[PDB]
Symmetry: C2
Subunit: 451 residues, 2 copies
């Protein structure tokens, strides 16, 4: 029973998250990412615009394309350098009040007992505003930073994923029962040892005695995001996610992905409203259509085709070292770019996708006036979009313009909330509910088991 869209800012603790070459724009200030002040400015603007959450993506490595020099990753800041997402989230707790603060953490980078302790602590310190995006994947280099020959294969990836979630739910939901905090000074009982338990977790990958070291936090289990794109990904998302970060190319493609996710939720034994679909988007906005277009052209000069080529060439295998920007994708001869040009045909103004349209794989950009952007967003919501995952082409500019121009329009039409509701991030996203996960959710099954 949430009538408004969920607004999530999609950022990353780095100089150039989303529109490769974007740092070079004189107008942009992503070069300031290592400072707290820059991030403070962004978090406060998003709170001013009534955003439900700010999200920080993260990675644990950096990789060359196959047979390519690593050079251009350093020169263009292509997701490198990369600073810790969790630290920034924490240092942002006191610069914000109501804004959700979400981060990615991978299976590989933190043992689930460690991570469970950290997340619990940030949930306490924040007042129940933490979210967690679960990463099972990784890149060759990230494997090699934690001493591993090569990638953990696709099957095992998600199975490891599952055990990890089983371990953190046992800790967050099972280890301390309701009523464990007593804190009676006169009677001399701080916590009730009859209600606190080891978890004695034993599985293929993890052995973990417990108990969990923290007091139950306001949410216990943080707000769960997941960006599974693949088959196993979508299934995992249906099992565990409260919001899934998706990348549909069109409203019709959202309707399909929506409908499919409803099937998987039913298989999971969850309700149709238990998971929001949150679509990747970015925005350029103006009082007239001519102003918006002109802002777009200014920013698009800083779109570095070779940096984008080096990001997409990693993510699709296929070498694209010499593609021109104005070159159509179908003019390139791979199975990857033949079927991605077919997909993109309807997402581009002219019906011919180009190398300069390849950012569409990562966020869908709408250019326009507040009214136009809102009408277009109305189509996406009616296709089953529950939320916006807003990436930036400039900081603080994309976020500032969106807040200053689009948010008021969306508010006027009742598509964005006018005030923050009281409660944890989970109670903000799912209005009538409890701070703890519903009984349909896997986590809920660890409640009570060790007593």
């Amino acid at each position: 029973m949430r009538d408004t869209l969920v607004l999530n800012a999609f950022h990353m603790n780095t100089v150039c998250h989303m529109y490769d070459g974007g740092w070079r724009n004189p107008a942009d200030r992503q070069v300031e990412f290592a400072t707290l002040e820059f991030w403070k400015e962004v978090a406060q603007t998003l709170e001013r615009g009534f955003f439900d959450s700010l999200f920080f993506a993260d990675v644990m490595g950096t990789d060359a394309a196959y047979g390519d020099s690593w050079d251009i990753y350093a020169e263009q800041g292509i997701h490198f350098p990369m600073h810790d997402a969790a630290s920034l989230v924490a240092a942002l707790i006191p610069h914000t009040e109501h804004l959700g603060l979400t981060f990615s953490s991978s299976v590989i980078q933190d043992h689930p007992f460690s991570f469970a302790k950290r997340a619990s602590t940030l949930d306490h310190l924040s007042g129940g505003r933490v979210g967690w995006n679960i990463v099972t994947g990784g890149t060759i280099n990230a494997s090699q930073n934690f001493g591993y020959d090569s990638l953990v294969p696709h099957d095992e990836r998600y199975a490891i994923g599952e055990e990890y979630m089983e371990v953190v739910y046992k800790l967050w939901e099972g280890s301390w029962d309701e009523g464990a905090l007593v804190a009676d000074k006169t009677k001399g009982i701080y916590a009730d040892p009859s209600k606190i338990h080891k978890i004695n977790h034993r599985g293929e990958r993890y052995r973990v005695a417990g108990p969990h070291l923290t007091l139950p936090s306001p949410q216990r289990t943080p707000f769960l995001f997941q960006a599974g794109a693949s088959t196993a990904g979508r299934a995992f998302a249906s099992r565990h996610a409260e919001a899934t970060l998706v990348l549909c190319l069109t409203p019709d493609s959202m309707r399909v992905a929506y409908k499919q996710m409803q099937e998987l939720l039913a298989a999971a034994g969850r309700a149709s409203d238990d998971l929001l679909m949150v679509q990747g988007m970015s925005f350029i906005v103006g009082s007239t259509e001519e102003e918006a277009r002109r802002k777009a052209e200014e920013q698009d000069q800083y779109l570095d085709v070779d940096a984008l080529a080096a990001r997409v060439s990693r993510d699709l295998g296929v070498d694209l070292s010499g593609a021109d920007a104005d070159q159509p994708l179908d003019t390139i001869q791979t199975e990857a770019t033949q079927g991605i040009a077919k997909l993109m045909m309807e997402a581009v103004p002219d019906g011919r996708p180009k190398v300069k349209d390849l950012p569409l794989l990562y966020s869908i950009r709408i250019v326009g006036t507040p009214e136009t952007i809102a009408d277009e967003l109305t189509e996406w919501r009616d296709a089953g979009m529950g939320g916006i995952n807003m990436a930036a082409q400039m900081l603080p500019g994309t976020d500032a313009d969106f807040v200053d121009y689009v948010v008021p329009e969306l508010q006027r039409r009742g598509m964005v909330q006018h005030e923050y509701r009281p409660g944890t991030l989970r109670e903000k996203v799912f209005p009538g509910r409890d701070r703890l996960l519903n009984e349909r959710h896997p986590a809920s099954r660890y409640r009570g088991i060790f007593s």
Copy 2:
């Protein structure tokens, strides 16, 4: 050279760090430890009294070492619950300006590439105020929380200790060279790939490719503390530490530990002034001897001697349940419990070390007036004490009193600094020096080795 004593507040993210049972004092507020607000009050008071840093110790397990029942650890909140130290440090960044922020992290809890990226981030985010206490040890439960049948033997702890430091120094000091950040937009070169390198570390415990993901931070390598009390500990502290958290029972005894530590530094190829001895203390203070003595009596009502014994047991690996308050510690039959009766004998007024006297293992309490406390700190400082490691019997009370009464006295006699010096934590502690570690330190050896 620094003329003033260094001031470190010695806390932990938990309900009852020191003076077990102390949480029960109606006048105390440590039951509020899970909230950021309580820690905001404590950090701000310490900064108001010109403290060099605030330190959070941390643990990764809880152990039933007091016999059949674990019960007492929960009922008395004996280093349980335990919340994450680095999260708290980070969310205090914005509530403080000049105060150093220090935390313990263990070898076991975080792979050293992952930890390297977090410290680096917090160092950027704090402006070079970050410190790190290196923990190599732990407890049976902590091992079992990370899937290990039992402890690693004392020998191995420090060898693992060494490889971990080696790994983080390669990342912090080796991986990016002196002009790697270019960030010229006109020219379009963010970082210089010829100046950034993999580390390709390979040893007994760790295989880490690298490179380090972060920009070089103000200090690069955080401010290093270490509390190795044993032979291998003191040695490791001598190779690595900038302050060593020690526990001498008297001024004569400090002089001996200082003199010993000077030899170890010479053997390390370091300098006599490269490492401060930071002594563990606590304070009850009043305008008359009689006020201070009354404060002591009021607080000591809440000193729970069973809880204390239960903590010593965990720290030592010995059961002390069958030991009543007045049993001499030498009549208990262990190397642990007879080693610390030998040590404790000059500080106990009656001469025969007993279990009633066990708070002495963790800090020395001076009770008195500002003038008395200062006279007596003067004796310790002439024995070679470089800093005070201050624990709390009450929060905010012990820190509040120390600031309001002792600090101004200490300032008047030139023993505590009047203002903060500008710069990174390392530059505050070692006045004439650089933000980066001196050429005599092991970390410097990794500058340039991968160009």
